[PDB]
Amino acid sequence: MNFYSAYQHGFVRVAACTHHTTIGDPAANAASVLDMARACHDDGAALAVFPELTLSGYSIEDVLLQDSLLDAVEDALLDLVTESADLLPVLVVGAPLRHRHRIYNTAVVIHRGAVLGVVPKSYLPTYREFYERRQMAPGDGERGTIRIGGADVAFGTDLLFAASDLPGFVLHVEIAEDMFVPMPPSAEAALAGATVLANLSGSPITIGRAEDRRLLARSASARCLAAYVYAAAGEGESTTDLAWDGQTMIWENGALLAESERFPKGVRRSVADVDTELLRSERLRMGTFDDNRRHHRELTESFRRIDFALDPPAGDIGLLREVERFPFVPADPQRLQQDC
Amino acid sequence: MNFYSAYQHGFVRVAACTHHTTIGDPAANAASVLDMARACHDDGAALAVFPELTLSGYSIEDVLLQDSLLDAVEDALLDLVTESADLLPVLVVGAPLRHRHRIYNTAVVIHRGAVLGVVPKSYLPTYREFYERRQMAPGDGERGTIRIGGADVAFGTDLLFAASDLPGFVLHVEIAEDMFVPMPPSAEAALAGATVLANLSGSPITIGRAEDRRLLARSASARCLAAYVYAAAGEGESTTDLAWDGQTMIWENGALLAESERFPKGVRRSVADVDTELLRSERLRMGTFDDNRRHHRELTESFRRIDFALDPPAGDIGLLREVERFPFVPADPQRLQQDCYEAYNIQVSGLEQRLRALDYPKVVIGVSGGLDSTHALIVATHAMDREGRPRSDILAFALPGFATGEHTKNNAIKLARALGVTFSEIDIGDTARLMLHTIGHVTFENVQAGLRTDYLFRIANQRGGIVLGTGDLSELALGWSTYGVGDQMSHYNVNAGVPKTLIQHLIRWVISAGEFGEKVGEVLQSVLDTEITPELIPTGEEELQSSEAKVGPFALQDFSLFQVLRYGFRPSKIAFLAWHAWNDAERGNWPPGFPKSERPSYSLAEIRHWLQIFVQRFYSFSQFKRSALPNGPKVSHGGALSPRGDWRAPSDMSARIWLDQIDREVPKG
Amino acid sequence: MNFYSAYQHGFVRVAACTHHTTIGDPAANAASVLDMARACHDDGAALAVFPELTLSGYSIEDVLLQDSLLDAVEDALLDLVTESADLLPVLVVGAPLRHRHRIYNTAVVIHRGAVLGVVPKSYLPTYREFYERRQMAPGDGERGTIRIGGADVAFGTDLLFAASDLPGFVLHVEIAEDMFVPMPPSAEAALAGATVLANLSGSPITIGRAEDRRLLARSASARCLAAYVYAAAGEGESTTDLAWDGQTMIWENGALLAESERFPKGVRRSVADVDTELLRSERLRMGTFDDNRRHHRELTESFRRIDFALDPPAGDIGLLREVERFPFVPADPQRLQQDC
Ligand SMILES: Nc1ncnc2c1ncn2[C@@H]1O[C@H](COS(=O)(=O)NC(=O)c2cccnc2)[C@@H](O)[C@H]1O
Ligand SMILES: Nc1ncnc2c1ncn2[C@@H]1O[C@H](COS(=O)(=O)NC(=O)c2cccnc2)[C@@H](O)[C@H]1O
Ligand SMILES: NC(=O)CC[C@H](N)C(=O)O
Ligand SMILES: NC(=O)CC[C@H](N)C(=O)O
Ligand SMILES: NC(=O)CC[C@H](N)C(=O)O
Ligand SMILES: [Cl-]
């Protein structure tokens, strides 16, 4: 084996991307997404998560209901897919999509020129600064397929994207408010076998909301013994009534793997190497995890596995991870004081 | 109603106890438990939670399978039950109980001489330092009844213990490892209507396990929008292979209400007052909570409600809760710095975007030298900076009409000239003097305000810019504006999100950060000192203190505003909260930057008076001014007052019921 | 028998009331409602329907979320119930009520000093001029009980209020948006045995909305072979962004029995005599009606019957109904032209 290949030791490179929203301009959002994704490709990442409703902008309210906007989103999405034929990572791109009667707040999971699936937001907030049920429809319980670019692809809150050559890498996709409810789609999905939990979030920034973002993302990564990839909306979202900080972060089992500048000027990424084997092991030893899955067997066998072959770079790409010299002696002095 | 009864204001007193374990002596554990329970009784608490396997000791391994031990456990449990007849709170005591084939790791829910229920542990950990499936049986899916002292009582992971006279108090009980799995029993129960989530925990202490306890407990309280009561095992558990820290804590909606000394010598309690109304309200407003419950309807209707009449003490028993004086301004210096950073950045960034949209116009602002205009100017400057735009596109304007001359206009000129903006002065007096005469002349102050805004708009038309307003959230709340043609109107209001109690500390933050000049800093501190100090002899009757004279002190009105906007609390509840926060200046904390000469103490009389003014001006008068409100970014978590955002309300509505409630419930003094 | 008693010939007198909303003042709404109900009592009515969110005002938006308002609503509701002990008609009063987590948009069905039931609105509109899912929760699928004034009363979209002494009088209650969806609760209810269909409506008035109100109400009364009672909100509702005409109307099997002045100055009623026997007979002969009920047997047996004794006046109280001299020859000249 190539001893210096991070992937061949169980690692998987993941990126949480915040892009340049151009509210109402889907082609201009897809341009920014394509550029950041090509960067992720150069970095050798396998996964790249963008913010909620990437292709249209989260803040555009009833402009979501205009046929020209929806059509431009579909065209930009098909453009993205076709460009993804030369891209290593799995792209997770937000979009307002047309299904049956309404438009759903979806994440399109795109890979190697194809749409693996389309996940709808499950819990649409309609309170305080949020008015989401006006324009969009909940997906909780929506299964089946959706037709996107002359193809029937998987659609629903019950998906898992398992890498056929990386048995540790199983991706699940929720959206914003999803992880804030007492029983988030991601927890069920984790019991069902999900190891990397992605979250696209629009998230207008507010005093203390970054603290909540971190609390819940970290606790999810801890409880679900998984990696959590978070990406929020940044510069470009309509400042009619809200502001946007563009926070991105990558958690692993309660441990902050990476995060980006808040309130940036320009796009940002958080790229890290997730040790899938560490999760595999924490789960092999914590029987009560499997015990919990079994207690909810019906909820957890109803997930659909979408198989894809990632084929990662097999050479030296470093290790974007802080391996401490002293596993028993933390190098941060305040933590070492508490430990002692 | 008794105004001073924490219970009659929706509070419930709860206890998380760590006791003196005496491994293998159920009588000695029942003794420690009865003593601590009698303490909680004297404190007026309604709930007291003890650690895992209380009556036997969590660490006694295969001694759990000895019949003499189990029998002594049953005897001590029956003793405890009988004694609980004269005990106010609901006791939640751990014990290994006999059911069908095996012994289950149970929490016995005891109250007023009867066993309300028996909740088994759901996920027995068998890994690393834990060997629980050896001695005991999982309870996930066990329903039915269990026979305890000649009575068939509910048994299962599906119970709820709801107070028939305290509807906000609905108890669910899980045990240790239960809260550590992807789908804890407590989440389901919360959806099913649980408001107080109890955890009995043995929890051998280890490097960083208190961190995990805190992480998951706080996360539970936040996600489940509930109170979380945690109690771990302490002195007396066999240190054959483990150590025990006896941590107890009480969380509420992600916020630590109380915790006790780790590794104590002797028993400990954490006693706090949980605001059930706060939970009730958070759940009233987060539709997605009920959305989630409905999505899991089968799981959430399968719960069994066991009804009990608590009958709590109706007198004054104080309030074991730290109510901060400034809901918008945290008294912790680290948190206040973080808050101020975030607020300042969202203001700057929202203006940055508005400007990029309009191909970078000029920025017209009338600067009077008060706090709101000063801060708006600073923000506009920083926005123009980060977008790489000449500061001379900022057009400050002092428009005086009837002021003879004052230090504040000098503040304005000095700050503007130190920043390097484009400053000009324009005396509106003549236009007002003409205008007044034309309409055949209170009215003249209205005319001046109108003319300031008119002139700024026409100058923005002339030089191709946008008027940037300076109205803050407190002025919007109370209607301290001139609507229409007046200081209310602008093209983009950067200060709309920010309350007036936070503007001062935003300016202090800008000073201490010192990103601008030292000269800018000095003039800003001048602005602060000038405006926050009352004028010896009133300077012409216009400054911040004038608004305070008409609408009450903002320290009190921002408190009322936070309560109303976030929780919809009734007036009497606001008066109770503010009276506990403010009536004693020596008690509680103060934020940084308050010289001890500016630390007041308000009376019930004053709180009641300004609350009358507040409900009258917020529910009724001022709404029509917010209804047509320029753009601007929401700042605090407490909400904003945009009609397109956090406050949808009618313009033609009376405040009669709120005034009537203040009259019926809040004492005159 | 007393030959001149309309009740003894199968009739039942029903009223659709629009009252004087006093937005934010529940006690004053209860005052207006009590006065109109007392009128309905004098008129010998068995049923009196008031508009959506009667006790609080429909248009008060986030003021529904203030604890003082909800508490005054509870107090006024209990006063109403106690006063209804001396009132003949069944009162159907709108109100925002507290249950489990949220407040539901409910109609309290009150009779002779007790609450027979509490029906929640089923479909909360969140589009155009409507923002209801913000403040209130859907009732579709909510069963069980609700606690109101120290009593557990039936709660849900599955109630029926059957008069034990007037078997032709079986009441069902839906609310506004309920009757505009492809499958309205009232249709199930009618198959289930409901003969008088009540609808509480707030209904901000608009060019052409009264036409739609009539279209759907009349179409309901015809398809369901039942009587339809409609009552909309009038003077007092916040004109911040909407206007209110206070239309009330009573339909029976496609035929307008009564209606009231639009945009009135002052409260209004529509009082009419419903020929329950005409409904009984149309249903006896239309086999396909019962056939439709059988095809939906599970949906239709799940309704709960709350029985109550109306005890109507047995004397001469006139007949509030236009009996045409020539059933074969309509007296309206235009209709007679069409008929010929
Ligand atoms: N001399 C000045 N030069 C330049 N700009 C000035 C000057 N005076 C005011 N402004 C401007 O009006 C904004 C706030 O007005 S105020 O003074 O706090 N209160 C009122 O107008 C008021 C209060 C109650 C009812 N109606 C009106 C300030 O931010 C500033 O932009
Ligand atoms: N609900 C409404 N909807 C629409 N228009 C309304 C409404 N209520 C009043 N008005 C009118 O608008 C003017 C507002 O005056 S103001 O410049 O904002 N200042 C003051 O009212 C003021 C008064 C007393 C003490 N301090 C300040 C009012 O005089 C009135 O004519
Ligand atoms: N990230 C989000 O979706 C923000 C909304 C959420 N209720 C919160 O306050 O954190
Ligand atoms: N209670 C905790 O330890 C929470 C820590 C978490 N990382 C946060 O910032 O919220
Ligand atoms: N208030 C409502 O629920 C909406 C009623 C309105 N008449 C409509 O047709 O939608
Ligand atoms: Cl202005």
UniProtKB/Swiss-Prot annotation, chains A, C:
Q: Where is the CN hydrolase domain?
A: 12-276
- Lineage top rank: taxon: Bacteria
Provide the Gene Ontology terms for cellular component. cytoplasm
Keywords (alphabetical) are: ATP-binding, Ligase, NAD, Nucleotide-binding
Q: Which residues does the annotation say bind L-glutamine?
A: Y127, S203, R209
Provide one Gene Ontology biological process annotation: NAD biosynthetic process
Active-site residues (renumbered)? E52, K121, A176
Query: What GO molecular function terms would the record report?
Result: ATP binding; glutaminase activity; NAD+ synthase (glutamine-hydrolyzing) activity; NAD+ synthase activity
Q: In which pathway does it act?
A: Cofactor biosynthesis; NAD(+) biosynthesis; NAD(+) from deamido-NAD(+) (L-Gln route): step 1/1
Family label: In the C-terminal section; belongs to the NAD synthetase family.
Its function, per the record, reads:
Catalyzes the ATP-dependent amidation of deamido-NAD to form NAD. Uses L-glutamine as a nitrogen source.
In Swiss-Prot or TrEMBL terms, this protein is called Glutamine-dependent NAD(+) synthetase
Q: Which organism is it from?
A: Mycobacterium tuberculosis (strain CDC 1551 / Oshkosh)
Taxonomic path: Bacteria, Bacillati, Actinomycetota, Actinomycetes, Mycobacteriales
Could you say which residues of the full protein are shown? 1 to 340 of 679
